[PDB]
Every structure is written in structure tokens, then in C-alpha cells.
């Protein structure tokens with residue numbers, strides 16, 4: 001069980017770790033988060049008390065290094081930092097856990113929510129969507145735009161999600177215009193799965209990462225990307241049976257986890273009604289359709 | 301964006317554009333089967349592709365063989381329309397290709413957009429106008445060439461005859477839409493108006509009678525009466 005210690009908490013802030021969150025008062029004696037489950041990516045995220053504008057945070061995997069959070073009073077945010085001195089990291093951390101100045105990652109043992117939300121999410125892929133190669137962890141915030149959004153301005157600070165566009169030459173084979181537009185199987189299975197993503201795991205990993213950035217940072221381009229990747233599967237007549245079954249599980253847990261009060265902005269009526277009720281796969285997402293109907297029947 | 305009363309004059313500027321109407325592409329007669337069920341029989345159709353500035357009409361005849369063995373024909377018709385429009389554009393020299401295509405029904409937007417991906421600089425636009433181009437099959441010579449076709453065929457017409465020698469495009473388009481609106485509201489009366497005076501004839505190479513300027517004012521007047529009337533006969537006013 002790993003640890004992300006904190007130098008201090010000089011400004012009042014709501015801190016999230018994965019789907020959990022807690023309030024830290026200005027200069028409260030807080031020195032980090034312990035007992036973080038090894039084997040999954042994690043996200044630690046922040047909303048300042050004084051400016052709920054800009055939620056921001058860091059995707060990381062404790063297997064890839066020792067990381068601590070230190071406030072920067074010049075740039076005005078909590079920064080993730082990698083300590084190369086493993087003994088100095090250990091020496092600093094042992095002081096913090098003995099003085100009990102850390103919160104514990106509060107994993108209920110029955111609970112598989114985080115695994116189910118990050119099943120296919122790899123750090124190596126995150127780092128290709130979020131380009132900043134001198135760090136092993138990845139910063140995301142509410143304002144960052146996607147490569148595709150920049151097409152329709154600063155590229156260093158972009159989310160390089162895979163561009164999906166249903167009215168594009170990549171999506172539409174010359175001479176199969178109607179066929180490819182109404183049944184997107186060739187775009188899903190040949191262009192995207194076999195060609196770009198290589199397998200369904202990488203596709204699902206990007207889908208899950210896009211949802212999580214939408215949920216935790218309210219990142220609009222991420223929400224667009226999540227819905228587009230759902231719609232591409234639902235609009236395909238020919239989808240491997242294992243992908244549909246896993247998609248249903250993936251979406252079920254995303255909808256289960258979404259804040260009840262954020263469904264108004266984060267869920268696109270058209271995509272969900274088309275996916276659950278008109279698309280080829282209208283019948284293939286039983287768990288997702290049940291939780292949607294019992295939790296957000298207004299949207300439908 | 302959409303074409304409407306406010307940007308109406310853009311139709312007559314010097315940027316090449318085409319209206320595309322698909323309302324007569326897929327045409328059926330509905331009838332009873334021996335078992336007393338209902339079935340459709342397709343008849344020949346046409347795409348109505350019109351340059352509103354020059355009057356050039358690219359009438360692609362849609363022969364019933366297009367539909368053989370196909371499902372969801374009303375949906376296919378929109379894609380067949382977009383395929384034939386795209387083929388027409390590709391067939392034209394670059395300096396003749398349109399800069400905008402205006403579809404009269406919004407359901408044509410995505411089919412045409414997808415077929416025109418190779419032409420990113422051709423704007424595909426809807427319109428808020430309720431244009432009467434469905435009535436093009438009330439023009440006798442157009443209806444005749446469609447019904448007589450035994451294979452796919454493109455036939456070229458000037459729907460303005462020689463009007464542009466005497467009037468502007470704007471005026472010619474206004475006359476055309478009034479004629480077609482009349483024909484759509486009451487075809488019999490409309491056609492009676494147009495052929496009442498046997499001295500006025502339709503030239504072999506024209507679609508409409510050879511009216512003098514003064515006779516056109518009278519004809520135009522009578523068509524507006526018909527439309528106002530039928531609107532009374534219909535709403536009781």
C-alpha cells in the first residue's frame with residue numbers, strides 16, 4: 001500500500017483521491033494520503049475554496065516512482081513532484097505516518113468501483129494522451145482542450161485523444177457512403193480497433209480515461225470523446241460479443257458513479273437515447289439500460 | 301447556415317449554386333393486392349437540380365430499376381440523390397462546380413455531406429423557404445421524359461426558357477416559383493390558366509408558353525388569384 005505525502009496545505013482546498021474527497025482547511029496539519037491500492041492508476045485532484053474555477057489534478061501509478069504534493073505559491077497550485085532519493089522520500093514519509101498526519105485511502109473491501117472504472121486504463125497510454133514526457137505523472141484540468149477541439153490553441157497543453165469524426169473520409173469508404181454512415185462497423189473494427197488502437201483493451205482504456213476526466217474535472221472535450229466512443233460502438237452492427245458485454249459493464253459503473261446532480265451536463269441525451277433505444281446495440285446493454293432508467297429516466 | 305427570406309438575394313449573385321430537390325426521386329402508386337392487402341408499385345422519378353441564376357436544370361431521371369431488391373427505399377432515395385448529385389459535380393470542370401448546394405429538405409443534409417467529403421469547400425445548406433419544386437412533375441414536358449425513360453438518364457433543360465433575355469434572374473425565379481406554387485395548390489386550374497388562349501404556343505425547345513411581357517403580367521395575376529382563392533376554398537375566408 002503506497003503513499004503520496006504532502007509538504008503542507010497552505011491554502012484551503014477540497015482534495016480528491018479517486019472517487020473520494022475531503023476538505024482541508026488553510027494551514028491545517030495535513031501531510032498526505034496513505035494506503036493507496038497498488039496495481040491501478042490513481043488520480044489526486046484539487047478544487048480551491050477561493051476559486052471553484054479550475055478543478056485540476058494528477059494521474060499517477062505509484063509503481064513508477066515516489067511522488068509527493070508540494071504547494072507552489074508562485075504558480076498558485078498543488079504540484080505533484082517525483083523524489084529520486086528513495087531514502088529521503090522514506091525518511092520524510094516515516095516522520096508523517098508516525099505523527100499520524102495522513103488520511104487513509106478509504107477502500108471498503110467489498111467495493112470494486114475503482115477497479116471497474118479503471119480496468120483498461122494504463123499509465124503508459126495516459127502519458128500519450130497527455131504529453132509531458134519529463135514527468136511520470138500527468139496533469140489534467142477543467143480547461144484543457146482536445147486535439148480535435150483545436151482543429152475546429154496551445155498544443156503543449158492539449159488532450160491528444162484519438163480523433164473520431166463520423167463525417168470524415170477516415171470514417172467513410174468511397175463507394176460505401178450510405179453503408180459506412182449507417183453501419184459504422186468498418187470504422188470501428190478496421191480503422192480504429194485493428195488500425196489505431198490495436199485491441200479493444202486500449203479502446204476501452206481511452207473511453208474510461210475520457211469519462212473520468214469529464215467526471216472529475218468537468219472537462220468538456222473529454223465528455224465529447226467519451227460519448228463519441230460509445231456512439232461508435234452502438235452504431236456498429238457488427239461488434240465482437242466480448243466487447244459488448246464488457247461495454248455494458250463499463251458504462252454501468254460509470255453511470256452508477258456519476259454524481260446524481262451532474263447528469264444534466266455530463267450526459268448527452270441524443271447519444272444515450274440513440275444508443276439504448278435505436279442503435280444496433282439497443283438490446284445489448286441490459287445492465288446499463290436498467291441503471292439509466294431507474295436513475296435518470298428524465299433524460300429518456 | 302440556412303437560406304431564408306433574409307438572404308434571398310444571394311441566389312442571384314455570381315457564385316455558382318444549385319438547389320437540389322429530392323421530393324420526386326422515389327414515387328409509388330399504392331394499390332390493393334388480390335388478398336386485399338396493400339402494396340406499392342414504383343414509377344420513374346427524378347432529381348430536380350437547378351441553378352437559380354441561369355435556369356439550367358439537371359434533371360436526373362431515376363428509373364424504377366434502381367429500387368429493385370432494395371430495402372428502406374425512402375432512406376435509400378436520399379442517398380441515391382446525394383450519390384447522383386456528387387457524380388454530377390465530379391463530372392463538371394472545376395470552374396463550373398457549385399460553391400454551395402442548397403437542399404430543399406433537411407433530411408438530405410447528411411447524405412449529401414457524406415457524398416461530398418471530397419469537396420470540403422462546397423457548402424451544403426438547408427433552407428427555411430417552402431419552395432414548390434415538388435410540382436416540377438406538373439410541367440408536361442418534364443413529366444413526359446421521366447415517364448418514358450427505360451433506363452437511367454440525365455436530361456438538361458432551361459426552366460426559364462428565354463426569359464433571361466428580357467428579365468433578371470430574380471424576376472425569373474419569382475415567376476417560376478409562382479407558376480409552381482399554383483400548379484401545386486390546384487394543378488387543373490393552374491394548367492387551364494396557362495393554355496386557355498390557343499394562339500399562344502410552347503416552342504419545341506421550351507417548357508412554358510411564349511407569352512409577351514404584357515401577357516405574363518396577366519398570367520402572373522391569375523396565378524396569384526388562384527393561390528389566394530384555393531387558400532380560401534381551403535380555409536374558408
Ligand SMILES: Nc1c(Cl)ncnc1N1CCCC1
Nearest residue numbers: 005006007068070083089092
Ligand atoms: N521529498 C518531499 C516529500 Cl517526500 N514530501 C514532502 N516534501 C518533500 N520535499 C522535499 C524537498 C522540499 C519538499
